[PDB]
Design a protein around this ligand. Structure first.
Ligand SMILES: N#CC[C@H]1CC[C@H](n2c(=O)[nH]c3cnc(/N=C4\C=CC=NC4=O)nc32)CC1
Length: 294
């Protein structure tokens, strides 16, 4: 008889599935390690009215890591963590909310006049609360820097990238890394530099360095890399990291930012105890900053 064919059921649309043909590139927002992020407009109606979204994808093996990153972000829900919106699919792109004020790296140099100490301390608390949540879900970020912190508004920041984020297995304190060549060594605790081990207290250390960036308004001439390279020497090459370890073993640390009150600076230094067990916790930090804000 007639041609037999499949009568397929009603196809309930998934709002987290973004079709490639409607995801339209506007510009580059930046890149880190093996990923890049782009401003796109998802524009199904084709009239430039679609929602603007941030799209993460691989630069031209690392597919597996992006997929793991997507699964991490999908299940994080917090006001100081950037929102997952969906995927565009072997290959895959991560679709997130777009924050037009950019990272702290761009925002802070341009907004010194409107962002006073009080607002910096509120940003710091918010960063701590997002990181404390990440810790409560048993992850270590391994890349906490001002460049990875996005500005929602004058009053709100969010941790906006999770590309090195790893799970600490239950009943263990740390994760051991193997791939370490693109490491942000100037944001890294001694146990990360020496033994390649990552604890929650190692994110506290990196937070300390992120707080320092915040307090200098991400001035490049005052960056943790620039400051450490002045301390230890700028032309050591492959010996750079060993001299960094030796400097930190000696008790030397990044100096107090200009106009940063000592009381804020002591909270920063408690992030930089050499032994992880002696470092402050994210909740202790929050209490600390809240006291200074009262
Ligand atoms: N891949 C990768 C790492 C990743 C690259 C991009 C890096 N970045 C800047 O350097 N400057 C930036 C300015 N804006 C945004 N915006 C967003 C990033 C993610 C999600 N929603 C955004 O709205 N992002 C920036 C942040 C870090």
């Amino acid at each position: 008889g007639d041609i037999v064919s499949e009568k397929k059921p009603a196809t309930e649309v998934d709002p987290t599935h973004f079709e490639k043909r409607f995801l339209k590139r506007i510009r580059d927002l930046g890149e880190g390690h093996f990923g890049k992020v782009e401003l796109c407009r998802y524009d199904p109606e084709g009239d430039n009215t679609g929602e603007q979204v941030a799209v993460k994808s691989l630069k031209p093996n690392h597919i597996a890591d992006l997929k793991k990153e997507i699964e991490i972000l999908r299940n994080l829900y917090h006001e100081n963590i950037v929102k997952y919106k969906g995927i565009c699919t072997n290959g895959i792109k991560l679709i997130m909310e777009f924050l037009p004020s950019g990272s702290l790296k761009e925002y802070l140099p341009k907004n010194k006049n409107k962002i006073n100490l009080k607002q910096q301390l509120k940003y710091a608390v918010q960063i701590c609360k997002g990181m404390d949540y990440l810790g409560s879900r048993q992850y270590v970020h391994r890349d906490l820097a001002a460049r990875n912190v996005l500005v929602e508004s004058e009053h709100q920041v969010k941790i906006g990238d999770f590309g090195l984020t790893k799970a600490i297995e239950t009943d263990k304190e740390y994760y051991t890394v193997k791939d370490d060549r693109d490491s942000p060594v100037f944001w890294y605790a001694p146990e990360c530099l020496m033994q390649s081990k990552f604890y929650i207290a190692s994110d506290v250390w990196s937070f300390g360095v992120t707080l320092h960036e915040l307090l200098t308004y991400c001035d490049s001439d005052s960056s943790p890399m620039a400051l450490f390279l002045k301390m230890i020497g700028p032309t050591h090459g492959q010996m750079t990291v060993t001299r960094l370890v030796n400097t930190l073993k000696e008790g030397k640390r990044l100096p107090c930012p200009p106009n940063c009150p000592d009381e804020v600076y002591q909270l920063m230094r408690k992030c930089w105890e050499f032994q992880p067990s002696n470092r402050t916790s994210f909740q202790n930090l929050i209490e600390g900053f809240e006291a200074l804000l009262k």
